[PDB]
């Protein structure tokens, strides 16, 4: 039978290879190009990250929600995949035209010069594979296929490292940039192979179609994807600027390092919510079964993140020695605060994915505004006085009261 634990086991395997391939490539980035190349590729790598969400108009969470909803009805399933295929095709071709025509302005903003126009024109084809690969991974998530999604990410991570090494050893710095963009793009080969071998959907379902009522619903998931790409990231951006003002930019660096390894080890659990929790809650239409599934998920993820966080705290000196440069070994005190906030943030993700599974833009704006407001009140109170440590208390206290409000709002929604 399918459960969150079985999906977490397959997710933990793909996440182990994903962070391992990212650490290997990242270390090769530093040895080959150093801080100078790492600073030039900062805006480019962020573009690749936002392309993983914005290449297919961010409908992937809606694709997973509606594929699971219409997992039985074949006719409506054709219209879900058909409309999703047309939106991914139309948006990525429009993005490719924007990247190929305005290659000079984008290079001017991403690198400061115009010497990277050809790289931007190559991104136009790269983001096409990113959008299509993310779509195929969304369909496999809608059918709760944890093995198909994990195997596609693992194989795509291996050929992504080989492609980076081939492109870097051939084209050099611009080749290493193309390889960094090709790592999320080459997942379309294992995703397509896994899509037709397991036979989850016929290939004719990918033929572009248009359902008006279904295109507007996926458009609501586009608005939600556009909201997360600005709301909380801007809040954090304001936090680093306030920290860099009252203290040093390196004091922002020790807070970024603790949060970086926090994002890696939390991905063992958060990546399984889109494989099991999102499709399961979309099929459930009764509040009795929704309450049972949400409570059952909290019974598993809360001890899981708490055990994983504790072991990270016991190995916090090990992380600073390896994953960090071991430059400011005093950040070991920033761990316990961030790791407690990681536990309560994971618990609140269950209520957040329930909001996604029900396509509630109302409860979505409410959730993002609450986290934005609480993060900003606690940052202005702790950062100017406690430094990077206070930035962790602001992160911990925000999600301590956010999980409490999520529980209270869920209780009022149940009764």
């Amino acid at each position: 039978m399918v459960s969150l634990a079985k999906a977490s086991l397959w997710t933990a395997a793909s996440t182990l290879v994903k962070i391992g391939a990212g650490l290997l490539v990242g270390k090769l980035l530093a040895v080959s190009f150093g801080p100078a190349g790492l600073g030039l590729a900062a805006n480019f790598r962020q573009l690749i990250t936002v392309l993983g969400v914005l290449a297919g108009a961010g409908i992937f969470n809606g694709v997973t929600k509606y594929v699971a909803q219409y997992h039985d009805n074949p006719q409506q399933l054709r219209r879900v995949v058909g409309t999703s295929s047309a939106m991914v095709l139309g948006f990525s071709t429009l993005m490719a035209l924007v990247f190929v025509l305005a290659a000079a302005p984008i290079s001017q903003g991403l690198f400061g010069n115009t010497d990277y126009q050809g790289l931007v024109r190559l991104v136009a084809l790269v983001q096409m594979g990113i959008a299509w690969g993310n779509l195929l991974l969304a369909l496999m998530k809608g059918f709760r296929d944890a093995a198909g999604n994990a195997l596609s990410l693992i194989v795509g991570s291996l050929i992504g490292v080989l492609a980076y090494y081939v492109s870097y050893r051939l084209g050099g710095y611009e080749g290493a940039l193309l390889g960094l963009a090709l790592i999320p793009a080459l997942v379309v080969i294992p995703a397509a192979i896994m899509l037709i071998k397991r036979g989850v959907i016929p290939l004719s379902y990918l033929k572009p179609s248009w359902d008006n009522g279904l295109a507007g619903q996926l458009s609501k998931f586009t608005l939600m994807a556009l909201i997360t790409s600005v709301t909380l990231p801007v809040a954090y951006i304001m936090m680093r600027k306030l920290l860099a003002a009252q203290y040093s930019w390196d004091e922002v660096g020790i807070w970024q390092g603790v949060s970086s390894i926090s994002d890696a080890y939390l991905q063992f659990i958060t990546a399984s919510f889109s494989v099991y929790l999102l499709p399961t809650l979309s099929r459930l239409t009764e509040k009795r079964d929704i309450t049972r599934e949400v409570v059952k998920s909290l019974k598993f993820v809360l001890p899981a993140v708490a055990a994983a966080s504790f072991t990270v705290w016991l190995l916090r000196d090990f992380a600073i020695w390896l994953l960090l440069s071991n430059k400011f070994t005093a950040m070991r005190d920033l761990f316990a605060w961030q790791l407690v906030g990681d536990v309560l943030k994971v618990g609140a993700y269950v209520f957040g994915y329930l909001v996604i599974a029900k396509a509630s833009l109302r409860f979505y704006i409410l959730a993002e505004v609450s986290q934005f407001t609480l993060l900003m009140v606690f940052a202005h109170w702790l950062i100017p006085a406690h430094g990077a440590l206070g930035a962790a208390q602001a992160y911990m206290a925000t999600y301590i009261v956010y999980f409490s409000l999520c529980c209270g709002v869920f209780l009022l929604w149940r009764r």
């Epitope: 190349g37 790289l119 051939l170 050099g172 710095y173």
Partner: nanobody, 128 residues
């Protein structure tokens, strides 16, 4: 730790003449760096001219300046030269020198300007 490139030797020469350019790079590990020359016509784009490697004096030239221009390096004086012979009015451009690491240049990326992080201001070369 940014290297500074200062070009010199630019002027106005008649057609068929010759003029030599120099570019001094600031810092150590000059012998470990890959040097190159680029030019830019008025209203055009940065185009490849010449490039010297980090060992054995491996050189690469653009087809338009092959046999006419000659690039050379001097690790003792931290400078590189571009002897421009057989000048024609098509060579009227601002010539700039660039510095990079062999891990950047790769195998086929020695002519791409985006693979040279450090650049010079550029000196003018005008052919009548």
């Amino acid at each position: 730790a940014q290297v500074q490139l200062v070009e010199s030797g630019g002027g106005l020469v008649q057609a068929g003449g010759s003029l030599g350019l120099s570019c001094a790079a600031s810092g150590r590990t000059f012998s470990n760096y890959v040097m190159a020359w680029f030019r830019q016509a008025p209203g055009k784009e940065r185009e490849f001219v010449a490039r010297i490697s980090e060992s054995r004096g491996t050189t690469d030239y653009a087809d338009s300046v092959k046999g006419r221009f000659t690039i050379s390096r001097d690790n003792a004086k931290n400078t590189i030269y571009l002897q421009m012979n057989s000048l024609n009015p098509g060579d009227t451009a601002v010539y700039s020198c660039a510095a990079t690491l062999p891990a950047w240049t790769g195998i086929i990326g020695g002519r791409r300007p985006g693979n040279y992080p450090y650049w010079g201001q550029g000196t003018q070369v005008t052919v009548s």
